[PDB]
Write a protein that binds this ligand. Structure first.
Ligand code: AD7
Ligand code: UDP
Ligand code: MN
Length: 290
């Protein structure tokens, strides 16, 4: 049951004077695409707080990537779901290397010890297995799961505007690209295969989520697809991201996040279309850190 919102005073939405004219703000299957200027966060905060929403955030910090946790968590404290209940789940091979970060009220962190795979590709891909079935606490502990890369920092608000049964995030390198340029898996022998005449968007492996049920469905399906591929002696070109893309093509997300939500300023600057940079890549040496 969902109670009434209280009286609220805010600017009237204007039917004939749209928020954003420069970007697509709804997909052809009527999922909102979340950009600054499309939402009133006060209304959304009310809706979600009235449901006592708890958000789980999973993050993997395997081997050298433990180095990224301090900034990741400190900035999450400033910017991620502030005012709501948050449960961080840090999956790591080094529980003792997890920094002691001070958390605001209603926020908690659990350290989950996992095995470290040799290949970075396997570390990245096996997140699907580890999230899916391996973890059973999620259903009892949180309402939504948000699954992100650790080599990142929050720079601005990331809040309940993202919550929905199933969401993906537009990859910052491809949001203006034609589908033929998307780096989908193109080999028909892979479960991740998408031909050149299919595809809505290229979604980023670094930021997806939804209800616990929908995230566990997605992660289970991607894990099983990866197992089929492995048996067939094929590894998809972009690993978990390739499978995520196939899944979201066939199971349309109920919101899509704009690249505000996954940006790389070093690589891509700050184009006019982005009013905020919310969650951004932390520069790293790929060869050294892996
Ligand atoms: C310089 C490196 C070139 C990166 C440009 C594209 O980003 C990569 O796109 C791939 C799909 O075509 C996969 O999504 C890779 N995971 C992705 O690389 C990451 C790390 C990379 O350092 C940037 O942060 C980029 C935006 O995202
Ligand atoms: O040695 C590794 C390799 C990968 N990861 C995890 O897998 C995610 C995806 O890998 P990475 O960030 O290297 O991919 P990229 O963003 O460079 O495409 C990382 O954010 C970590 O959460 C990790 O913990 N240790
Ligand atoms: Mn990353």
């Amino acid at each position: 049951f969902m109670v009434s919102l209280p009286r609220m005073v805010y600017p009237q939405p204007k039917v004939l004077t749209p928020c954003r004219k420069d970007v697509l703000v709804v997909t052809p299957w009527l999922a909102p695409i979340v950009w600054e200027g499309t939402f009133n966060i006060d209304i959304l905060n009310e809706q979600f707080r009235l449901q006592n929403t708890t958000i789980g955030l999973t993050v993997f910090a395997i081997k050298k990537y433990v180095a990224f946790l301090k900034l990741f968590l400190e900035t999450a404290e400033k910017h991620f779901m502030v005012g709501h209940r948050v449960h961080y789940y840090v999956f790591t091979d080094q529980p003792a290397a997890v920094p002691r970060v001070t958390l605001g009220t209603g926020r908690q962190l659990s350290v989950l010890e996992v095995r470290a795979y040799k290949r970075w590709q396997d570390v990245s891909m096996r997140r699907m297995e580890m999230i899916s079935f391996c973890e059973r606490r999620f259903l009892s502990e949180v309402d939504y799961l948000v699954c992100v890369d650790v080599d990142m920092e929050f720079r601005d608000h990331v809040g309940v505007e993202i919550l929905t049964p199933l969401f993906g995030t537009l990859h910052p390198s491809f949001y203006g690209s034609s589908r033929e340029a998307f780096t989908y898996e193109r080999r028909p022998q892979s479960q991740a295969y998408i031909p050149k005449d299919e595809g809505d968007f290229y979604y980023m492996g670094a930021f997806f989520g939804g209800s616990v049920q929908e995230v566990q469905r997605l992660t289970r399906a991607c894990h099983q697809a990866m197992m089929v591929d492995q048996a067939n002696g094929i590894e998809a070109v972009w690993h978990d991201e390739s499978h995520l893309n196939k899944y979201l093509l066939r199971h349309k997300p109920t919101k899509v996040l704009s690249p505000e939500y996954l940006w790389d300023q070093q690589l891509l600057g700050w184009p006019a279309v982005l009013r905020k940079l919310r969650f951004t890549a932390v520069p790293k040496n790929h060869q050294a850190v892996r």
